[PDB]
Every structure is written in C-alpha cells, then in structure tokens.
Design a protein around this ligand. Structure first.
Ligand SMILES: Nc1nc2c(ncn2[C@@H]2O[C@H](COP(=O)(O)OP(=O)(O)OP(=O)(O)O)[C@@H](O)[C@H]2O)c(=O)[nH]1
Ligand SMILES: Nc1nc2c(ncn2[C@@H]2O[C@H](COP(=O)(O)OP(=O)(O)OP(=O)(O)O)[C@@H](O)[C@H]2O)c(=O)[nH]1
Ligand SMILES: Nc1nc2c(ncn2[C@@H]2O[C@H](COP(=O)(O)OP(=O)(O)O)[C@@H](O)[C@H]2O)c(=O)[nH]1
Ligand SMILES: Nc1nc2c(ncn2[C@@H]2O[C@H](COP(=O)(O)OP(=O)(O)O)[C@@H](O)[C@H]2O)c(=O)[nH]1
Ligand SMILES: [Mg+2]
Ligand SMILES: [Mg+2]
Lengths: 54, 132, 436, 436, 426, 427
C-alpha cells in the first residue's frame, strides 16, 4: 500500500450469495501479513533410490 | 532587491538562485548589529504565527527553518518567481537550510536543480526511434 | 587558561564548524581571521586567549585540530567561509575511510595518522601557557570518531596524564538511527572512553530533534539546527573561563563536583530557554522560570527519563541578567518538589555558576536574543538504563556473530568483543550499587 | 584520492557502459567531445575518481572495454559520447565466445586476459589510492560471464584488499534469451560467491515491467533499460563524488550491508520514476520518495521481497533533505511492516544523504536491499540446470573443451548450499529454541 | 485542515462533478490552467480542503472520477477546465454497465473496486485530518448506482467514523430515463439507508421546474441543471471554506438534522434565483431570501413538503447580514405555519452564517429540510417496483448474473417499513 | 490584584474578542503590544515594552482562532496562548466532553498553570462560554471540573450564554444545556446569565440599530464585564473586589444565578433629549426592558442586589435612589433579607470605542441581582427538554459518543431539584 507503508491484504470479493441484510448497516458502526514459511528445518524427503539399495 | 555577496568565482550563480538571496549570505557580518531585520533575528511582521493552522503555499519547501521565516522565504520565492523562466526549478537557496560551511557563498552549491539535461527523459511516442 | 579542542570525524567537524562559527561571533572576529578596525563590540583584551591565539599582528587563529580520514568533509572547511581562519596544518585528513569499522580505524588506518596528529597537538599545547585541558568531540557511531577517537585519547593520556579531557559524544538514538553496526562501535568505544575521559557528556540526536520540532517549532529540522544548539551548550559551560561572573566555575570544578567515583562520569545535558524570536519577547522568562524549564524530561539533550533514576549531583550555569539572590531562591523550590529526588548520601546537591555575558544569537540561526539562560549539566542513575538498552541490542546481534567477520579481519580478535561486553555489564552494576 | 577503475564485459556490458559513461560525463559537465563545459566548482573537485585528465584539457574515462568480437567495439565507438574513450583500452579478441562459458573461461580467456590484465595493471597503477574495481557484465553469454569471471579472479588474486562491485544482469525467469542460460549462470555465480565483494543483480524482465507500468512507456527500447541501470550506478557511487551531510562510500555500504561473508547479492530500486504526465502533478517530498522506493513492484530484479524477510537495507538519498524526515520514514516503514524484517538485527536500515541531486531533479533516492527472498532466483536456476544436466543436453559443447562433469556437479552443489544458507538465516529466530 | 474527498460515479456524476469543480475553482480564484490568481488572501487559507499543492502554485483537485466506460470522462477532459484533474485519478472499465445494477455491483465492481479503493485510500491518507467523503451519483443508471453503491459499502467499512454526503438524483415516472429505473432505485435506496450517513435527494423534475418558473430560461441545457446542483454543493460546504460568525461544518449539520438514524433523506433548495428580467423589480434582503427559501416551488425534489411535516430544517446563509433579522425570520416562518412543523421538537430550524458570498452576489442561502414528505417519492418508487416484480419484467438480466430475488424482496421491505415510520412520525 | 479570563467556544472567543479591544483601548495600549500599574490586572509587563494579556482563547474549530491570528492583534497575544484543535465538537456535549476534550484539556490547563504561576495576587478566574454549543458546553464543563480540583478556593466567575426562550440557532441545545448545568451548579461560584433575545430587544429599542449583528452584542457584553472589573482596575470612592460578589450575593452555596443589567444603553441622539442622572438610571436598571436575561422579575422576589456605579457619582444620591427603590411596591424583596443592596462607586467614566453605537456618558450603572425569575427560566427550558426526550429524539448521537441514558435522566432530575430549591427559598 503506497498510502500507508504497511503491506495489506486485498479486499475480499463481493459474493451474490452473501448480500446486505436489513440491519448490517449497524453492525458496521460497532465493528497482518508475514513471509510465508521458507522452511529450513523441515524434513526433506528421501525416496529409497540409493545406489546401495540398487 | 536581492543580496549581493562580495565573493567572486569563475562561474556565475544560476539566475534561479542569484535572483533570490537573503541578507544572511554575506561574506562579512555586521558585528555591531546582529539583532536586526537584515538577518531575520527579530520577529518577522510577515510570516504566520507558530500556531496558525491555515494553508501556507510552501508546505514542504523549507526544510530547516522556523514557521515565520519559512513562510517569509516561500512567499518571496513565489513573489519573484515571475521574472524566471517558465519551468523554473522549485527549490531555492533561502528555503534550503543555511549551513555554516556555505554562508560565505564561495562556490556554486546549488545548480543541479536547474541545469538543462536529458537524464531521465524517456522517448515520447512521436520522438520514439528504434535506433535503426 | 587556554583549552584546545580536537574534532574527530564526520560529526566532529560538522559540529565543530558550528562551534567555531559561534566563537568568532562572540569575540567579534570576522571570518577573515581578525577583528575589525572600528566597532569594538567586546570589552576585555584577554577574553579570546583561551580559544584563539593572537599571532603577530591582528590575526586570531583557533586552538583546534579538525582531524578525519575521508578528505570529503575537511575539504569543505578548507574552502568554505572560513578559508582564512583555520590555519592549514590543523585540518588533518587521511586518504581512505575507516568506513563504520571501529577495528579498521583503531588498528589499520589509525596508526599511520595518529603520529601526525599527536605531533601536531604537541606544538599547539606548547604555544599555550596555562593549558587547562582538552575537549574532544566525536560520534561513537562511525569508525573514525570511534576507532582513532579512542586511540587518540589513550595516547593523550600517556603524554599528559593529569590534563582534563572533556568528552562530548553523540550516542546512537534508541530507535531513530542511520547505521547498522553502531551497536558494535558504541560498546567497543565506551570501554575505552571509560578509562581515559575525565567527563563524558551524552547526546542523542533524536532527543534534540524533539526539541527543535516542539520548542523551536521547526517542522522539518536538519543536522545544522542540531549542531547549532550544541555550541550554545559548549559556549555556556566555558563562558566562566572567558567572561567575568559573580560566581565562576572552571573546568577543574566540574570534575570535582560531579564525579563521585572514578568511572561514573556521564552527564545529562539540558538547556533553557530554547525559544524562538516570536515567543521570546512575549513570554517573560525569570531566573526562577527557566530553571524550572531546565529540569523536565522534555528538555534533556538525551532521551532518558530522569524519573527512572536518582540525581546524584547537578550543575547549573546561568548567563545574563542574573543576580545570586534569585539563583538561591529557585534552587530552594526545586529541592522541595517530589517529582525529582537526589540520592541519599548527597544532601548538598547543586553547584551554581553565574556569568554576566548574555548568550549571543547566530544570524540566520533559530534562537532569539535572550535576557538570561541556563545550561544544566546533571549526573543521574537515569543513564543506567541507556547502556542496558544499548547492551540488549548489542548482544542481540553477537549471538549469531553477525558483522563480526569485518572486525577480526582488520586486526581484532573475538576477545575484544567479549572483554568489552563484560565491561559494560560491570558498569551497569556500578550504577546499581551507587543507587542503593 | 579514492578511485574507481571501470571494466565492461561483453555486449550487454558494453552497451550498459556506453550509457553509463554518458550519464556520468554529463553529471560532471563534459561534452561528448571530452572537453569541460561545466558551471560547477563542485564538479571539478572530485572528477579524478573517474577521469584521468590528459594533456590538452581533455578528460577520458578510466574504463577498460573487453569482448571477443569487434562488432561491439565498433558500436561503442560509434554512438554519442563514444569517442571520449581512450582507444588503447579497447581490448578484444577476434574469434568469439559463442555463448559458451567454456570458451570464455578456458580457451579465449587464457588468450585475451593477459593483455587485458596488462591494461588493467597500468590503469590501476596510474592513480594513487584505489577504492575499487567496478565490473559491469551479464551472466548469460560466454565472454561476459566466463571471461569476466576469469578477470574477476585474476584481479582479486592481484589486488586482494580492494573493493569490487559487480553489476550483473541474470537470466529472466519467464522468458529466457539463450538455451545455455543455466549452464552459464551456475558456473558464473559459483565463482562470484568466492571472488566478488558485492554483486548488484539486475533483470531485463523487471526492467520491462517497470518501464511499462510505472514509466508507462509505449515501447521501451534497450536505450531506456541501460538508462535506468546507469541512473542506478550513478546513484550508488555519487557519495564519493559529492559532499553530503552524511557520507557513505563503497566500503561503508559493504560493511553495513553484508553481515556474513557469503551474502553479497543485493537487489536494487531507484526513485522517482514517473511518466511525464504525472510528473507535472506530483510533488517531490521524502514521503513520495520512500513510498515508491519500498514498493516491491519497483525493484530492478526478479526477486519479490514478499517471499522473504529483508536482511538489511540501505537508502542513498540525493538532494538537500531533512534528516529527521528521512530517519522517521525509515523508522515507520520498519515498524509498521515488522514481520518482513529480520529479527536478530535491530534497525536494519542504513541511510545516507548526498547534497547534490541528479541534474534537473529536485530530489531522488536509491535503494539497495539485501533480502533473503533472493533465493528464488538461485532455486529456479538450479532446478533448470539440473533438469538439463540429468539428460546432458548441450553438455558436449563444454565437455569437449576441457571441462569435466565434476565442475558442473560442484557448481550445482555450491549453489544448492548457498540457497540453504539463505533459508537458514531467513528462518532463524532470536530466542533460538522455537524453530525446533 | 478538514478535508473533503470528492467522488464522482457514472455519467451524471461525472458531468455534475465537472461543473462542480469549475464553480469551486472559480470561487478559489484558480484559473483553468491550475495557478492561483485571486485577489484577497482569504481564498488561499482554505484551499487545502479541496486541492493539493503540486508544483509552484499548481493546485489539483482531490477528486476520484470513476465509471465503467471512459465515454463520459473523454468529454469531461476534452472540455474547459480539463487539465486540472490528475491523470492518475481516472479509473477505467472496458465493458460498460448498461443500466444493469448487477453489472455495476457484482461483475464489474469485482475487478474495478480494488483499483479505486487504492486511489481513494491514497488520496485519503495523503491528508492529515479527514472531514469526510462526498459522493455524486445517480439512482437510475448502472455504473453510477451499482459501482457507487459498492464503493459506499467498502468505504463505510474501512473509514467508519468520518462523514459521508451523497448527492443522488432519483428517478421520476414523468422524467423517466431508463426502463429499469425502479429496479435500480429500489436496490440503491436499500443500500443507502444502511450505509450512507445522509443523502440529499435531487431529481430532474424539480430542476426543470426551477429553471422554468424561477429562472425562466429559454433552453435549459444540462449544463445549467448541473450548475444548479453545483451551486447547492458549494453552498453546503461553504462554512468549512470561509470564516463565519456562526460556523456549521458537515458533522454539525448532520447532528442538527437527523433525529433518528434512518431518517436521513433531505430535500434541498437554493436561493436567490430570479430571472434577469426580474432582477430589476426585486431587492435582496433576508426576508426576500427566506420567502423564496420556504416556497415549495424552490425545492429540488419531487415531494411537496406541505404534504407532510418538516421534522427539522437547516439554512446556511452567506454574506454580511444581521443575525437579528436571520433569527426573527426563522422564528416568524415557524410560528406562522404551525401545521407543517412537528410538535415534539421546538425550534425545528438550525441556522448558520458565513461571510463570503459567491462571486458576483451580495447575499445567498442554501436550505436542507429533513421533511417527512420524502416518503411520497419512496412510494412512487416502491409501487412501480411491485408492479414490475409481480410479473418478472426485466428480471432475468439480474437473476442470470448472480443476484437472487431475496435482494429484491428485502429491498422492498426496507423501503416499505421506512415509509411506515415516516408516516408514523408525521 | 490580577484576574485571568478563559474563553471557551465560538461565542467565548468573540465575546473576549470585543473585551480585549476594550481593554487595550482603556489603557491606551497599541495593538503591537506597547504603550506610547493600573493595567497590571490584565496585561503582564514582559521583558520590556511589551504587555501580553492574561487570557486564553481555546476552541476546537481552528477557523475563528486563526482568524484572530491573522487579524489586527497578531502582535498582542502570545502565539502559544491561542489554543485550537483540528476538528469541532459539532453541537455534541458527549463528543466535546469525552472524545476530544480528553486531548485538548491537558494542554489547556498546563498552560493556565504557568499563567497562574506568573501571577502573584490572583483574584480569580472568569470563564466565558455559551452552553448552546458543544465546545462551549462540553469541554467547558470538563475544564471547570479540573479547575475546581486544581485550585478550588479561588473564585470562578461564570458569564454564560443560555438559549433564549424562542430565539435559537440550534436544535439539540436543550440536551446540551441540561447536561451543562449538572456541572454549572456545583463548579462555578458566581454564574451570570446572558440570553440573546433580551440583548436583541435592547439593541432594537434603545440603540435603535435595525440590523444588529453579533459584534454589537459582544460590544455591550464587554461593557458589562469591563464595568464590574473596573472596581479592581480604576480607583473610586467605594469599590469592591471579586470576593465581595460571592459574599453579598450568594446566600446559599447552590443559589448563584444572577440576572445582569446595565444602564444607560442610549444612542447618540436619544441622549440629547434625555437627562442622565443617578435617579433614572438606577430606576431604569430595574425595568425588565433593560436586563440582559429574558425573565420578568415582577413574578419573582429579589434576594440580593449589587450596584456598580461608574463616573461622577458621590454617595449622597446613590443612597437616596436605593432608598426610594426599597420603598417602591412594584418590586418586592424576600423576607429572608431586609437590607438587600450592595453599592459600589468608581471614578472613571465608561469609555467608548470609535465606531461603536454607544454614547459617551458621564455615569453608568451595572446592576447584578438575584431573584426567582431564574426559577422561571429553568422550567421554560425544562419543558422543551422533556418534549424532545419523551420521544428519544437525537439520543443516538450522545449514546454513540459513549454516554448512556443515565446522564440524561439524572441531569433532568438535577434541574428538578434546583427548581424545588428555588420554590422553597422564595417563600
Ligand atoms: N549531531 C550530529 N551528529 C551527526 C552529524 N553527522 C553525523 N552524525 C552522527 O555520526 C554518526 C556516523 O558517524 P559519522 O560522524 O557520520 O562518520 P564517522 O564517525 O567519522 O565514521 P566514518 O564516516 O566511517 O569515518 C551517525 O550515527 C550520526 O548520528 C551531525 O551533523 N550532527
Ligand atoms: N452573544 C453571542 N452569542 C454567540 C455569538 N456567537 C455564537 N453565539 C452563540 O453560540 C451558540 C452556539 O454555540 P457556538 O458558540 O456557536 O458553537 P460552540 O459553542 O463552539 O460549539 P461547536 O459549534 O460545536 O464548536 C448560539 O446559540 C449563539 O447564540 C456571539 O458572537 N455573541
Ligand atoms: N540491459 C541489457 N541487457 C542486454 C542487452 N543486450 C543483451 N542483453 C542481455 O544479455 C544476455 C545475453 O548475453 P550476451 O549479450 O550474449 O552476453 P555476451 O555474449 O557475453 O556479450 C540476455 O539475457 C540479454 O537480456 C542490452 O542492450 N541491455
Ligand atoms: N442533472 C443531470 N442529470 C443527468 C445527467 N446525465 C444523466 N442524468 C440523469 O441520470 C440518469 C441516467 O444516469 P446514467 O447515465 O444511466 O448513469 P450511469 O449510466 O450509471 O452512469 C437519468 O435519469 C438522467 O436524467 C447530467 O448531466 N445532469
Ligand atoms: Mg565519518
Ligand atoms: Mg462552536
């Protein structure tokens, strides 16, 4: 977001199944990202293809 | 009535910075009268009050001056901006802070903001060529 | 009574060039080096002799040496306004930087230049007659200001020993900073600024930003507006040497009346009134008023809260239209407040000092011509937190040994990093043991 | 004083060098005829950092051009600011590498590098105090990659303690431009990880992205890409050529960016880029600079920092600016998006301010961010390399020229370990127990 | 200091906004090229509310012009006062809406609203102290109503505490532009009762009535109607922009006019509006302004206020005048008409004065009367909607797009119970 | 003998805007701040050749404050003494009392503290506000609470502006007025009412201005406050200080609501045909056509009255006139107090502003009484509060800001208790 230096999630898409009910106008008045994993310590797989097995 | 520093060098200062010089950029002080209107050492009749919440046309022009001095300098900038070329540079030697290094006005410290260049001008569709 | 000042590094020279801009205005010395024909603004034919040395006929050259490794800033002084003033052999300059590398400036690059400086500082201290001491300026962030700034001090300790060496540092701010290695340079230097300086004065840039923004109403500030109101602090704690006062205070008094123990010498500056020209003449400032304004946490030149600690011993320089009746009238009230408190075993407390010369204004500067001003210099256990915050982020990096491969490549070893850290951890207990 | 010896390798290198010598020569005020025409006393003072003033009043760059075909020699002689080069530093073979790292590093290298090194040795001993060698090349071809790599290794073993910049473009992810792209890039980076001091990574793909979205150019030629890269290089080395309130040279930036001796692959952005339409309406303020500077869509690389934590960052601003604003913007961008910055380094951002902007602009900035999201490039390149190598495509063109298969295997393994180290220093925590 | 972020949606919104920025730029003395050329320095002090300084006296509006087809914005930019808008503020659609509320709210908003939210969010946090947003759109069109409505929902979701004015033109059966006018108006009002803070109802019937009875024009092109709406909008936010004896900001006005959270549909009127043949036979006094204000021929809605009761009212005056005459006039017109004012509210009229009239006039005034006769316009909309919805006319271009029929039934229920409580309070 | 004067809200600043014009004109102080001891009560002599006033204009909307900053008296005030927020309170008591007050009041009262510390002989404070608005009533109330807990034993004279019975320029001001009085009861010491309908009628009847604006209202209000502070400023035969008001006009610590009046309000031409003596101006100060609050004291009973006299008055006939008044039967005094007058004389005649509408008269009277006609005012406001509250109108605004129904009900019953007290004491 150029406006506020904070990275922000994009707004959810409006769905037709979920419309605007009678009172949700008052629900409004009353009404955080991270780098994903880059997992370094997780177990890398190893298939049984070793030359010794062969 | 811009100030004339007694310093002389090979080049001349650009008009967009020589046309607007304050009393501070002299070679020789007036040891007798430091508090005076020459050096903006007395309250400026012009310049808004420190609390003023109106809109002053400077906004971000001045960088290290107090509100009244900043407003004075920016107003004088917009005032004599008429005699300058049309797309004149936006900054000025008065708006920029006065460093003890450079009060003597020895060298040409502020010229880049106005030099004719082709630095970051990418080609327009009419001027576009594939370098045949 | 002559004192010479060395400026060490990018910050040392920039600060110094505003400090010397000021003195030339205090004693009517035009930038060409000499006082004018007419217009004898000053009284006292001797006053300048503690900073300037009159050479031959009509020429006052400073007692100072700008020293640095990069030739980029010194050569701004060589051709600035004061081309005439600073004589050529004091603007020392090297060829390649220490580059934010304490070890590089202390072991590799410092050694070939330190001999040139310590041979110059000699034949300055020889032209002198009654050398009071030195006062050094540096920032403990970079390499030049930290590496040889420490190496220079140590060798000054051998050649002189007892001559006072005032320390005006510019410490890294808690969060608003410009470097990354500055936790490493700050610890490695203080460990050697600990046992060689006589009085050290902390100074954080950010806590000076908040002053200019709030008090001087400068929306966008810059290093000049900081280096400007630093000389106003140097000017004030030395005006007792230059001009006559009702109750004066010399350099050897600071050391005696502020340092309870040989290692606890770090001072909390302050100043008042810091006020612009527009509010200067509307709000009368009485000797009892400004001394109040010189004790709030909102007016310290360091970003530490004096409420977390107990004042040990304060110092108060007044200037201008001040009589000793009111000085003692106000200091009475300050001791009576309950928001500030002295340590148990210091019942005496303050040390005042009055000088008749009002502070001078710097044209194009920011302050106003003031009737009377104060330059408070305290000594509290409030810094006891500063090193702890500065310790936390040092050890935060050292556990991965980040950035270290640079320092050992230049001649250090992993010993210095440790032996400097357990020094700082020991210094913290000292501020704790005292505060009991 | 400080000196930068410039070296251009291959076709990409030579075109970028032509554009870079044009922007710099105009920055310092010399016409395409080589004569000086400036307006600036501040222009002359530090031209020796790039120029050797030949007799007759004509400045010539301190650049050495190398390749294996006379076509690019003719090209760089032809264009404007092309006859400013000394015709003896145009060293070139006659066969051609043929986009073959083996030919560039073993056969034509070992034949041309001798004369190249003679020229470089003469050019380096010309000046007094070398700051560094700058090397602009690519990583796809043979003579840019292999010959440039051989040259880097020779220069390191000759001058073991001088700075070394490598401006390298890398193969684009989505659309390649050479079938042996991975075979070249792998060996090249395997050597760069050992010899170079810092490598600034570029990419034509990101350059197109920028020129098409931000600049909103209809048709960007190669002129504009080289234009942007030249602006970036001028920015990164301005601080040597101009005096600033806070200075930062090559060695200082290296010390402050590179925490561990293997992590020296940066990513780059430049600000402000704006189409001539919005240029009329936008105002140039430090907020407007930093907002575009920190944008991921502004980096001139294929690495997107949303996939990794910024290890460190550096920002070189140019133009006369508020240090308070600069530092507060840095603090805000560091504190709001706090999860995207590494933990065990407090205050990850170095800042610097040079007082002279690029001509015509009021204010500008350059960003150099060492991020752990740069592992994407190596992971992609290494998987493509192994995809080709498992079936031995195009391998004979290298094998039947001196190289074995152990060389390829060693290079792939070294790249595959560099990426694992990136992963480690990305996912490491401060408390050190949580990750297990 | 207090900032009004302007938002234009659709064709009417873009053309109304074009005349709006022409009038405001003239009031602040900035010429069409973008430079300040005023006389008094009263004008500089309050142009942050509407402009941003670009470069050397270059002030650019704080406006966002949106629609699903650049056809209207091409004519907007081609006209006079075209170079002032920043090229980045325009937003685009290649498809086109076509009077289809579903197309404007479900299929094209789904990819348009993210970009315009980026533009609004950038323009909203560039400034320091937001006053609120101000929207101009229609209730009959597709890209005005649909896109504008989703924007209101998103903005009230993100910045819930700031004010929001909506100038919306409503349809009438006699001035009936589109055929799906009830299907768009009904769904739009259903959203506005739950999202907007206050809505000022406009319509082309009363605007023609004004131009033919009061102005007595010959050929009232749309430029003049758009000017009347423009003069109204400027008169609303006058007190923010100029010093006054008794200031009235936007929030000040909303709290004095809205007694219950659902009753925020106002009818507006502007004065003085007299023909050029009758500017000789008249005077300009506060009685002359008030007599013309409370006349029902000078409203800008198709609802006769004397078919019901004024709940509250507001009057913003401009020009040097005497507050005694202002107060006694409001008190007189309230005592004499004892039947058109509600009983359980004493002093139903809020008044405020500003000291800078529009250029070329000695004295002006603007009226905002929250009446209860507005439910007559909601009935003539609701009954048309039942007439069509009973037999599924035009319904499939909505249903075949994703919308369900429960949105229609619910829209009818909120329209019907809202007119029920209007009728209760009368 | 120094009195600092704070001004809260849009009406407070404009009232003080005419007050300080009058003060600079009475002591001849040039607008740039210097003269070409008597002034010591208002203007502190700072540095040298500079007199800065002991006032604070504070507001939340910056429009009128920075109009002062641009006007003629730039150089008179401090730059730092004109406090102003960024956004208004918008006729909303709760918004001005709990949302924005919480940030502006701390800077305000930490400014007044060093104003009071500059002072040495502080007589007391005096506050200027209108309870119809949000800033005047909301943080006005909040400030008065924190003044009472800070200083307490010092006087706080309150010159408030209530809503008139039929004249009104708002709708929710009954809610604001009732919520304001719940603290105006027990926090201000001496509260002087000032309606606007009464001043409109005065300007129309006496000054014959057919088109009066707020400036004329502010000017004659400034005449009243200047006339009752001239006892401290200028020297007279028999003058009082601020502490005499609360001593001779407040019989019980909860009955302090003073009708103000003034005489003679006379134009330039009506003056030629009328003799201005002590007899008729003391009589005309008791007619309901010359009071500043619209209420009919013929229905009420006077509890205590104070008469400030200015000009050429020696006590013989002022004692005669108050004697005749005591014998009159049109007006009645309460049994609880047989001698219900407090006279005070001052030598200096009231000055005139060039361009003002008041004539230059040699003698004047500022009457400040106490009655039960105020007990009529509170009911006339209580009725039109109960009309709106019975339908729960406009409540959601205050509840949204953070209050509840409890403060409405308890503030209404506080007015009921005050009414019960006035009907008890009047017996
Ligand atoms: N107060 C003040 N501090 C400064 C100024 N310039 C730089 N600094 C401080 O200096 C620190 C960095 O060191 P520098 O003085 O710039 O350079 P150095 O100390 O000589 O170290 P090297 O540049 O590597 O030789 C920064 O953290 C700043 O806090 C200044 O003008 N005023
Ligand atoms: N006597 C007199 N009364 C005034 C003047 N100006 C405003 N008022 C009164 O102020 C009352 C409304 O409150 P304001 O002062 O206008 O506004 P506020 O008190 O600041 O509250 P906000 O508007 O929310 O900031 C109105 O009923 C007016 O009668 C004035 O100049 N003289
Ligand atoms: N930026 C830039 N990149 C280029 C240019 N010409 C070629 N390249 C890049 O160079 C790569 C091919 O390498 P090559 O030029 O054959 O290297 P060489 O044979 O050693 O000179 C491709 O990925 C191109 O993107 C140019 O003019 N500008
Ligand atoms: N006052 C005014 N009304 C307009 C203008 N253009 C269209 N309208 C009205 O707006 C309605 C049609 O709006 P429309 O163009 O369909 O909105 P959109 O298609 O969603 O942008 C009709 O009732 C017109 O009377 C205009 O320029 N001025
Ligand atoms: Mg340095
Ligand atoms: Mg108000």
């Amino acid at each position: 977001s150029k406006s506020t230096l904070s990275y922000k999630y994009p707004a959810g898409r409006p769905n037709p199944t979920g419309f605007l009910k009678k009172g949700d106008g008052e629900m409004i008045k009353t009404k955080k990202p991270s780098p994903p994993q880059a997992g370094a310590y997780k177990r890398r797989e190893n298939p049984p293809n070793t030359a010794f097995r062969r | 009535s811009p100030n004339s520093t007694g310093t002389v060098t090979q080049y001349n200062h650009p008009m967009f910075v020589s046309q607007r010089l304050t009393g501070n950029f002299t070679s020789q002080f007036e040891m007798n009268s430091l508090p005076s209107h020459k050096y903006e050492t007395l309250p400026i009749r012009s310049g808004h009050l420190p609390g003023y919440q109106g809109h002053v046309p400077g906004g971000v022009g001045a960088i290290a001056q107090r509100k009244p001095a900043a407003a004075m300098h920016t107003m004088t900038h917009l005032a004599t901006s008429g005699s300058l070329p049309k797309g004149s540079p936006q900054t000025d030697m008065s708006l920029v802070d006065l460093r003890p290094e450079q009060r003597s006005m020895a060298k040409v410290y502020m010229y880049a903001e106005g030099a004719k260049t082709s630095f970051l001008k990418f080609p327009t569709p009419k001027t576009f060529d594939h370098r045949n | 009574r002559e004192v010479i000042s060395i400026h060490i590094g990018q910050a040392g020279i920039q600060v110094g060039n505003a400090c010397w801009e000021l003195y030339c205005l205090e004693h009517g010395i035009q930038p060409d080096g000499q006082m004018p024909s007419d217009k004898t603004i000053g009284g006292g034919d001797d006053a300048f002799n503690t900073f300037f040395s009159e050479t031959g006929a009509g020429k006052h050259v400073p007692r100072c040496i700008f020293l640095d490794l990069e030739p980029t800033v010194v050569d701004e002084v060589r051709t600035g306004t004061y081309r005439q003033l600073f004589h050529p052999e004091q603007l020392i300059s090297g060829k390649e930087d220490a580059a934010n590398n304490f070890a590089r400036g202390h072991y590799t690059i410092g050694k070939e230049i330190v001999d040139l400086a310590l041979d110059r500082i000699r034949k300055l201290a020889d032209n002198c007659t009654g050398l009071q001491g030195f006062l050094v300026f540096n920032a403990v962030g970079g390499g030049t200001g930290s590496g040889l700034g420490s190496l220079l001090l140590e060798r000054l300790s051998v050649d002189y020993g007892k001559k006072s060496k005032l320390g005006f540092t510019v410490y890294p701010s808690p969060q608003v900073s410009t470097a990354v290695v500055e936790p490493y340079n700050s610890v490695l230097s203080t460990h050697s600024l600990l046992e060689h300086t006589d009085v050290a004065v902390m100074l954080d840039n950010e806590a000076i930003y908040d002053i200019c923004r709030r008090s001087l109403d400068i929306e966008r500030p810059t290093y000049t507006n900081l280096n400007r109101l630093i000389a106003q602090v140097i000017s004030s704690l030395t005006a007792s040497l230059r001009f006559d006062g009702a109750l004066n205070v010399d350099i050897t008094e600071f050391q005696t009346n502020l340092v309870p123990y040989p290692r606890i010498h770090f001072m909390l500056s302050s100043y008042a009134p810091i006020i612009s020209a527009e509010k200067a003449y509307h709000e009368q400032l009485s000797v009892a008023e400004i001394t109040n304004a010189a004790f709030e946490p909102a007016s310290m030149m360091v970003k530490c809260d004096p409420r977390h600690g107990k004042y040990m011993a304060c110092c108060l320089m007044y200037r201008g239209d001040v009589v000793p009746k009111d000085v003692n009238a106000s200091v009475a009230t300050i001791k009576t407040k309950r928001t500030i408190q002295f340590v148990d075993w210091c019942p005496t407390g303050f040390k005042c000092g009055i000088n008749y010369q009002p502070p001078t204004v710097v044209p194009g500067g920011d302050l106003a011509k003031v009737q009377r001003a104060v330059c408070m210099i305290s000594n509290s256990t409030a810094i006891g937190e500063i090193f702890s915050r500065l310790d936390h982020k040092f050890d935060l990096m050292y556990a991965k040994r980040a950035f270290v491969h640079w320092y050992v490549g230049e001649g250090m070893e992993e010993g210095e990093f440790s032996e400097a850290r357990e020094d700082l951890a020991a210094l913290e207990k000292d501020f704790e043991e005292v505060g009991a | 004083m400080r000196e930068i010896v410039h070296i251009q390798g291959g076709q990409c290198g030579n075109q970028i060098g032509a554009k870079f010598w044009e922007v710099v020569s105009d920055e310092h005020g010399i016409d395409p005829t080589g004569t000086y025409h400036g307006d600036s006393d501040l222009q002359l003072e530090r031209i020796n950092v790039y120029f050797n003033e030949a007799t007759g009043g004509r400045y010539v760059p301190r650049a050495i051009l190398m390749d294996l075909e006379p076509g690019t020699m003719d090209s760089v002689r032809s264009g404007p600011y092309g006859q400013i080069f000394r015709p003896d530093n145009f060293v070139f073979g006659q066969t051609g590498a043929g986009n073959n790292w083996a030919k560039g590093h073993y056969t034509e290298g070992a034949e041309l590098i001798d004369s190249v090194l003679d020229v470089v040795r003469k050019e380096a001993e010309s000046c007094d105090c070398l700051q560094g060698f700058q090397v602009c090349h690519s990583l796809g071809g043979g003579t840019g990659s292999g010959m440039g790599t051989l040259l880097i290794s020779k220069i390191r073993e000759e001058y073991p303690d001088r700075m070394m910049l490598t401006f390298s473009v890398v193969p684009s992810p989505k659309v390649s431009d050479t079938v042996v792209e991975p075979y070249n890039a792998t060996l090249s980076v395997h050597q760069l990880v050992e010899n170079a001091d810092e490598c600034m990574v570029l990419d034509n793909e990101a350059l197109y992205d920028i020129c098409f979205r931000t600049l909103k150019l209809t048709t960007p030629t190669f002129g504009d890409l080289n234009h942007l890269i030249s602006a970036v290089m001028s920015g990164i080395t301005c601080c040597l050529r101009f005096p600033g309130q806070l200075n930062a040279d090559l060695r200082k930036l290296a010390v402050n960016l590179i925490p561990f001796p293997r992590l020296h692959f940066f990513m780059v952005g430049f600000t402000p880029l704006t189409s001539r339409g919005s240029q009329q309406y936008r105002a140039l303020t430090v907020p407007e600079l930093t907002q575009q500077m920190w944008d991921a869509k502004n980096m001139m690389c294929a690495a997107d920092p949303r996939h990794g934590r910024y290890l460190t960052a550096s920002a070189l601003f140019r133009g006369r600016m508020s240090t308070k604003e600069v530092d507060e913007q840095m603090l805000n961008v560091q504190n709001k998006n706090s999860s995207y910055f590494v933990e065990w380094i407090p205050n990850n951002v170095k800042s610097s301010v040079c007082d002279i902007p690029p001509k015509g602009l009021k204010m500008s900035a350059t960003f150099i961010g060492n991020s752990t999201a740069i592992q994407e490039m190596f992971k992609r390149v290494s998987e493509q390399f192994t995809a080709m190598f498992r079936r031995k495509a195009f391998l004979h063109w290298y094998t039947g020229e001196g190289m074995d298969e152990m060389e390829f295997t060693e290079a792939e393994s070294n790249m595959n370990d560099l990426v694992s180290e990136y992963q480690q220093y990305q996912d490491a925590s401060a408390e050190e127990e949580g990750e297990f």
